[PDB]
Amino acid sequence: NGYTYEDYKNTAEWLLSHTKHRPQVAIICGSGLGGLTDKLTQAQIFDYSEIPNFPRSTVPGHAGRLVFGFLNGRACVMMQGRFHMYEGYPLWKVTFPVRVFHLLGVDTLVVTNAAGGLNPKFEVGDIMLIRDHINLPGFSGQNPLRGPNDERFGDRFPAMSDAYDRTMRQRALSTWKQMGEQRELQEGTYVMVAGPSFETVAECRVLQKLGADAVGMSTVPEVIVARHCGLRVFGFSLITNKVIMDYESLEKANHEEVLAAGKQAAQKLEQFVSILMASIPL
Amino acid sequence: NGYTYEDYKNTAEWLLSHTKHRPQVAIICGSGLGGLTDKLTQAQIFDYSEIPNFPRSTVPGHAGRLVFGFLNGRACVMMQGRFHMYEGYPLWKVTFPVRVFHLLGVDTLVVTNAAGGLNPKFEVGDIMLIRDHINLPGFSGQNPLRGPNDERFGDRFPAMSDAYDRTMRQRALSTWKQMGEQRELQEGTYVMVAGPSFETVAECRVLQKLGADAVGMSTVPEVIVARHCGLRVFGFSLITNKVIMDYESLEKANHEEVLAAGKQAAQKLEQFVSILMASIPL
Amino acid sequence: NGYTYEDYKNTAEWLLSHTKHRPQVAIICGSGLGGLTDKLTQAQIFDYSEIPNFPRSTVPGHAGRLVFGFLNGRACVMMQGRFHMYEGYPLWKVTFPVRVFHLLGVDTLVVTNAAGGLNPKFEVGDIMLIRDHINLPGFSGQNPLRGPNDERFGDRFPAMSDAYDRTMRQRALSTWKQMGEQRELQEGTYVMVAGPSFETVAECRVLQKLGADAVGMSTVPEVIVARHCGLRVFGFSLITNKVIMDYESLEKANHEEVLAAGKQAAQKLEQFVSILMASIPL
Ligand SMILES: O=c1[nH]cnc2c([C@@H]3N[C@H](CO)[C@@H](O)[C@H]3O)c[nH]c12
Ligand SMILES: O=c1[nH]cnc2c([C@@H]3N[C@H](CO)[C@@H](O)[C@H]3O)c[nH]c12
Ligand SMILES: O=c1[nH]cnc2c([C@@H]3N[C@H](CO)[C@@H](O)[C@H]3O)c[nH]c12
Numbered sequence: 001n002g003y004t005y006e007d008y009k010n011t012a013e014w015l016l017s018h019t020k021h022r023p024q025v026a027i028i029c030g031s032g033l034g035g036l037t038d039k040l041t042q043a044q045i046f047d048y049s050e051i052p053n054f055p056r057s058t059v060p061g062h063a064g065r066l067v068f069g070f071l072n073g074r075a076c077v078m079m080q081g082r083f084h085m086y087e088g089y090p091l092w093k094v095t096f097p098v099r100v101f102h103l104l105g106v107d108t109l110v111v112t113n114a115a116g117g118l119n120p121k122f123e124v125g126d127i128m129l130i131r132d133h134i135n136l137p138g139f140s141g142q143n144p145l146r147g148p149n150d151e152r153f154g155d156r157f158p159a160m161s162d163a164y165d166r167t168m169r170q171r172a173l174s175t176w177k178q179m180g181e182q183r184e185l186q187e188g189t190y191v192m193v194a195g196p197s198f199e200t201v202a203e204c205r206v207l208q209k210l211g212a213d214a215v216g217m218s219t220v221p222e223v224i225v226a227r228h229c230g231l232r233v234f235g236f237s238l239i240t241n242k243v244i245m246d247y248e249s250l251e252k253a254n255h256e257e258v259l260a261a262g263k264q265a266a267q268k269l270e271q272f273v274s275i276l277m278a279s280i281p282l
Numbered sequence: 283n284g285y286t287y288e289d290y291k292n293t294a295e296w297l298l299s300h301t302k303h304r305p306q307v308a309i310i311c312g313s314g315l316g317g318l319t320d321k322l323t324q325a326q327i328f329d330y331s332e333i334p335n336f337p338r339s340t341v342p343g344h345a346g347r348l349v350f351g352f353l354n355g356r357a358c359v360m361m362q363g364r365f366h367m368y369e370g371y372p373l374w375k376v377t378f379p380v381r382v383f384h385l386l387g388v389d390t391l392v393v394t395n396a397a398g399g400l401n402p403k404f405e406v407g408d409i410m411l412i413r414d415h416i417n418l419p420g421f422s423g424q425n426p427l428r429g430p431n432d433e434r435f436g437d438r439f440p441a442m443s444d445a446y447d448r449t450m451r452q453r454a455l456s457t458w459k460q461m462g463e464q465r466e467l468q469e470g471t472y473v474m475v476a477g478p479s480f481e482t483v484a485e486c487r488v489l490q491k492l493g494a495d496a497v498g499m500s501t502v503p504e505v506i507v508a509r510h511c512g513l514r515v516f517g518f519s520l521i522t523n524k525v526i527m528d529y530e531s532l533e534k535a536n537h538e539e540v541l542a543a544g545k546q547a548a549q550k551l552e553q554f555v556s557i558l559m560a561s562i563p564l
Numbered sequence: 565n566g567y568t569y570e571d572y573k574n575t576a577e578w579l580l581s582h583t584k585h586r587p588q589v590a591i592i593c594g595s596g597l598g599g600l601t602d603k604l605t606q607a608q609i610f611d612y613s614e615i616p617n618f619p620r621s622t623v624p625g626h627a628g629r630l631v632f633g634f635l636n637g638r639a640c641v642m643m644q645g646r647f648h649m650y651e652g653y654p655l656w657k658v659t660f661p662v663r664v665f666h667l668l669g670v671d672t673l674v675v676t677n678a679a680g681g682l683n684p685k686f687e688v689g690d691i692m693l694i695r696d697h698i699n700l701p702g703f704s705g706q707n708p709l710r711g712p713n714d715e716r717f718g719d720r721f722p723a724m725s726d727a728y729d730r731t732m733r734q735r736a737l738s739t740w741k742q743m744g745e746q747r748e749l750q751e752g753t754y755v756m757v758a759g760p761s762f763e764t765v766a767e768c769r770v771l772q773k774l775g776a777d778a779v780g781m782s783t784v785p786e787v788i789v790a791r792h793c794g795l796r797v798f799g800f801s802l803i804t805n806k807v808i809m810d811y812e813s814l815e816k817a818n819h820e821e822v823l824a825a826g827k828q829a830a831q832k833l834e835q836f837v838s839i840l841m842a843s844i845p846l
Contacts, residue, residue, distance in 0.1 A: 001652075058430045060438075088283075088429035131811070132766040139767075140422035140704035141758040147652035148622045149760070156624075159816040160764045161808045189766045194423040196431070197506055200442045202414040202471045203421075206492050210770050224761055244443045247413070252441040340712045342720075370565075370711035422704035476705040478713070479788055482724045484696040484753045485703075488774050526725045529695070534723040 001092040001147045003053065008096075011053045012103035019044050021068035023077035025280060026101040026231075027273070028222060030113035032262020033238065034080040036270050040069030048081075055083050055093040066097075074277040077101060084218055085137065086196035091144040095225040099153060102229040108280055109226040111235035112269065114258050115216035116199070116243040118208050119188060125265045126239040127272065128186040128214050129172055130164050135220045137194055144221040145228060154228035163227050168234040171279040172272075179272065188213030190237055192220040198253045204243045214239060232281075238265055283374040283429045285335065290378075293335045294385035301326050303350035305359035307562060308383040308513075309555070310504060312395035314544020315520065316362040318552050322351030330363075337365050337375040348379075356559040359383060366500055367419065368478035373426040377507040381435060384511040390562055391508040393517035394551065396540050397498035398481070398525040400490050401470060407547045408521040409554065410468040410496050411454055412446050417502045419476055426503040427510060436510035445509050450516040453561040454554075461554065470495030472519055474502040480535045486525045496521060514563075520547055565656040565711045567617065572660075575617045576667035583608050585632035587641035589844060590665040590795075591837070592786060594677035596826020597802065598644040600834050604633030612645075619647050619657040630661075638841040641665060648782055649701065650760035655708040659789040663717060666793040672844055673790040675799035676833065678822050679780035680763070680807040682772050683752060689829045690803040691836065692750040692778050693736055694728050699784045701758055708785040709792060718792035727791050732798040735843040736836075743836065752777030754801055756784040762817045768807045778803060796845075802829055 016022075021044055029036050037043070048054045048064035057064040064081040071078075083094040098109065115128070122128065135143070149156040169187070176185035191212030193199070199207065199215065207215050214237045226233050240261035241253050298304075303326055311318050319325070330336045330346035339346040346363040353360075365376040380391065397410070404410065417425070431438040451469070458467035473494030475481070481489065481497065489497050496519045508515050522543035523535050580586075585608055593600050601607070612618045612628035621628040628645040635642075647658040662673065679692070686692065699707070713720040733751070740749035755776030757763070763771065763779065771779050778801045790797050804825035805817050 085423055086425070086428055132764050134764070134766045134770055136421045137423050138761070139700045139757045141649055141701050141706045142423045143650070143758055143761060145760050146650055146758070155819065157760050157762060157817075157819045157822075159762045159818065161762065161768075162816060163764060193421045194425055194428070196427050196439050197420070197425060197510070198439060198441045198443065200414050200416070200445060202416045202493055204443075206416055209492070210773070211766055228761070252444060253439075254441065255437065255439045258439075367705055368707070368710055418703045419705050424705045475703045476707055476710070478709050478721050479702070479707060479792070480721060480723045480725065482696050482698070482727060484698045484775055486725075488698055491774070534726060535721075536723065537719065537721045540721075 003092060003096060005150055005152055007053045008099050008103055011051060011100050014052050015104060019068050022075055023068060023104055023106050024075045024282065025108045025110065025277065026106040027076055027078045027110045028082050028112065029078060029080055032114060032259055032266065033112050033269055035266055036273060037067045037078055037080050039270060039274055040067060040071050040076060040078065043067055043069035055089055055096060058087060060087065072274045072277040074280060077106065082218060085142065085194050086217055091142060091221050095144045095221045098222050098225040099229065102231060106231065108232040110273065111219050111222055113216045113219050113237050114240040114262055115190065115214040115237040116241050116253060117239040118204065118215055118243055119213040122186055122213065122239045122242065124239060124241060124261050126183060126186050127269060128188055128237045128239060129169055130190045130235045130237065131169060131187050132164060132189045133220050133223065134189060134191040134210055134212050136192060144225050154230065158228045160224060160227060163223055163233055165232050165234050168279065172234065172276060175275055175279055190214050190216060190219065192216060192218065199243055201244055201247055204245050215243065238262065238269055285374060285378060287432055287434055289335045290381050290385055293333060293382050296334050297386060301350050304357055305350060305386055305388050306357045306564065307390045307392065307559065308388040309358055309360045309392045310364050310394065311360060311362055314396060314541055314548065315394050315551055317548055318555060319349045319360055319362050321552060321556055322349060322353050322358060322360065325349055325351035337371055337378060340369060342369065354556045354559040356562060359388065364500060367424065367476050368499055373424060373503050377426045377503045380504050380507040381511065384513060388513065390514040392555065393501050393504055395498045395501050395519050396522040396544055397472065397496040397519040398523050398535060399521040400486065400497055400525055401495040404468055404495065404521045404524065406521060406523060406543050408465060408468050409551060410470055410519045410521060411451055412472045412517045412519065413451060413469050414446060414471045415502050415505065416471060416473040416492055416494050418474060426507050436512065440510045442506060442509060445505055445515055447514050447516050450561065454516065454558060457557055457561055472496050472498060472501065474498060474500065481525055483526055483529055486527050497525065520544065520551055567656060567660060569714055569716055571617045572663050572667055575615060575664050578616050579668060583632050586639055587632060587668055587670050588639045588846065589672045589674065589841065590670040591640055591642045591674045592646050592676065593642060593644055596678060596823055596830065597676050597833055599830055600837060601631045601642055601644050603834060603838055604631060604635050604640060604642065607631055607633035619653055619660060622651060624651065636838045636841040638844060641670065646782060649706065649758050650781055655706060655785050659708045659785045662786050662789040663793065666795060670795065672796040674837065675783050675786055677780045677783050677801050678804040678826055679754065679778040679801040680805050680817060681803040682768065682779055682807055683777040686750055686777065686803045686806065688803060688805060688825050690747060690750050691833060692752055692801045692803060693733055694754045694799045694801065695733060695751050696728060696753045697784050697787065698753060698755040698774055698776050700756060708789050718794065722792045724788060724791060727787055727797055729796050729798050732843065736798065736840060739839055739843055754778050754780060754783065756780060756782065763807055765808055765811055768809050779807065802826065802833055
């Protein structure tokens with residue numbers, strides 16, 4: 001880990017003295033869900049590039065910003081554009097923001113991402129609540145906590161079985177009723193794989209048999225660092241595609257389609273998140 | 283990744299100006315299958331050590347060469363001796379040749395390797411066509427594409443479900459009939475593990491339950507880089523041994539036996555490959 | 565690997581000329597099992613920090629020592645405090661001692677660790693003999709042998725299916741009868757995960773379905789290096805907790821509880837080990 005405790009502190013303090021805003025809820029917008037930034041009011045934007053110690057983006061979409069503001073009654077901070085392991089970032093960089101949020105005073109982290117559906121029942125457009133995750137990179141060593149533990153943040157061996165807030169998932173199921181939507185609010189296990197290439201059929205079968213419902217290339221690292229911090233954690237996946245499970249099918253998962261789905265069910269996710277803010281304690 | 287786009291270009295151009303040969307098909311010979319180099323005509327040999335930017339071998343068998351020539355009607359380029367992750371090479375070195383081949387004008391990659399049989403039906407000497415693969419190292423982060431994507435080679439999120447050419451696998455099943463062999467041409471899923479040590483019984487059971495048919499310590503990285511490039515891909519495994527699946531058995535998988543099998547079914551593989559060249563488009 | 569063959573030699577020779585002791589059996593004490601050091605006689609202690617080339621501890625418990633002596637008729641060497649991958653150590657450091665032991669003249673390695681129980685039959689306090697292991701980090705590349713192989717230690721592709729000594733496991737089952745204990749001596753498969761955070765429910769389910777009986781964050785690397793060396797290997801896990809397998813349960817795995825169990829069944833393990841020494845050849 002290239003960051004000392006001081007680096008996290010210096011970054012937090014810089015931010016605190018450059019905005020009057022004091023966030024409680026941190027929101028990490030996944031792929032094609034950065035729209036949420038438009039719904040904040042009293043919005044103050046910061047480019048990642050101007051924030052000391054922040055991972056400087058390579059050349060994905062060149063858009064990397066921290067937006068502070070209010071979202072339906074909650075003092076928020078949103079990450080529009082997140083860091084991925086597949087881009088070459090070591091996990092201690094990918095999750096660097098999460099620890100900054102904590103020192104800013106945040107106590108809740110909402111994570112969203114786009115993911116392939118592994119559960120045969122899921123459909124494009126569906127929203128899946130995350131009850132649990134399978135951290136494959138973590139089993140092998142790619143765990144954001146690897147390295148000396150800093151007592152100031154958390155314990156050496158933090159538990160994850162209770163990572164996804166029970167209370168918030170229920171209130172999420174509740175709130176969805178108010179939406180009175182056509183489809184139900186899905187719920188299941190999220191499995192992380194490093195990517196950046198998509199799964200083969202054999203690989204999809206594996207992920208299925210392991211009990212995963214959706215597959216993505218992010219999130220788990222941030223969740224683990226959050227929990228290690230004491231942050232409350234809630235999140236969901238936008239099923240942008242149904243991974244191929246048979247060899248007969250003549251279709252391929254492509255970024256084009258993912259973004260497309262990200263465009264359709266776009267504001268559908270944003271609403272849910274904005275409303276759910278009221279369901280978050282203080 | 284220590285290689286810039288320029289490095290790949292400089293290597294390709296050096297090769298292009300040092301041989302009149304212009305390959306279409308690149309062939310990566312696995313363990314004990316380097317014999318194929320003898321069947322090329324108008325053969326021109328290059329030691330890896332003389333090629334700019336090529337990974338310089340440590341001390342496996344000290345034989346590392348690029349052989350250009352013609353194989354049964356096709357302008358080829360063969361790798362006699364390939365790079366492995368278990369030797370300490372980062373995947374961007376292991377797969378460095380594949381991207382060079384692409385800039386040389388190659389459009390097809392044939393990969394062969396030796397592997398343990400996981401499917402109880404397979405037998406030593408058997409040849410298994412590869413219909414799909416399970417990339418375990420990739421799930422955790424060891425994917426040759428990790429790092430910034432260069433648009434010039436391919437897309438950020440390339441698909442792999444259609445990695446192994448459907449057309450060529452059928453023509454391979456076809457051609458094998460002409461061989462009129464005793465045993466049938468096997469076909470299945472290849473699972474990659476990093477090695478260099480062999481699987482325990484419990485591990486073999488795992489690989490079996492994941493749906494793999496053969497286990498090896500290579501290939502998948504080259505395949506992914508090829509596909510990312512647009513290369514057509516065909517390949518197979520020589521089942522040099524039946525991995526131990528029970529604790530009662532009193533035998534151990536050893537390099538001696540693998541090489542031995544590599545010696546027996548030696549020319550049997552070479553023929554198939556040489557003939558199959560005619561089955562490859564242009 | 566940052567160590568040349570010379571480094572291992574220099575460390576062994578330094579040790580040999582700083583103690584008259586000449587160990588035959590090396591014992592690696594897991595978490596809360598370092599008590600075994602008290603049972604050695606003619607004991608000579610060495611802090612890891614004073615041993616050339618030894619990984620210098622960060623700040624776990626600040627206790628890192630090599631204790632030479634005699635344990636019930638056997639010339640031993642014990643590691644009180646072992647190195648873990650989750651602390652940031654590359655596997656070639658974690659396993660550096662094992663190769664030193666070999667050059668000191670050791671021919672047997674006994675490994676103990678604390679682990680969560682995955683098999684529903686196991687109970688806290690139980691002792692599980694290790695018949696086999698599933699090396700998940702190894703499948704992805706985190707194998708202590710990665711890098712050039714040194715013929716002087718072992719072969720390039722060492723087998724592991726026979727890693728856990730058949731003879732010693734039987735004599736262990738035998739000896740346990742003499743204990744005439746309430747509970748039986750358990751036996752099963754150990755799965756290694758990198759940690760340092762604990763498994764989620766979904767992850768526990770995975771490990772279960774893979775056929776593991778106990779999960780830990782160590783051991784496998786040392787075992788592989790031992791075997792590669794020719795060392796006889798015997799070991800066991802102290803089931804300090806039953807991993808959560810359902811979402812209803814309202815309990816969390818914590819270091820507190822692990823240490824607690826380490827304190828209870830403490831001397832129960834020590835005895836077994838001390839007695840078992842007599843069961844070890846010469
Ligand atoms: O089927 C899938 N497999 C793996 N990742 C994704 C994704 C997510 N979307 C992104 C690529 O569009 C990538 O960052 C990944 O996290 C969507 N569908 C899938
Ligand atoms: O049972 C097996 N498990 C894993 N790899 C191999 C191999 C391949 N052969 C090589 C070792 O002889 C090694 O490079 C690996 O890629 C043969 N049999 C097996
Ligand atoms: O349930 C478990 N999962 C993973 N590791 C452990 C351990 C072992 N104990 C240590 C943490 O107390 C850690 O080093 C790990 O190796 C006990 N219980 C479990």
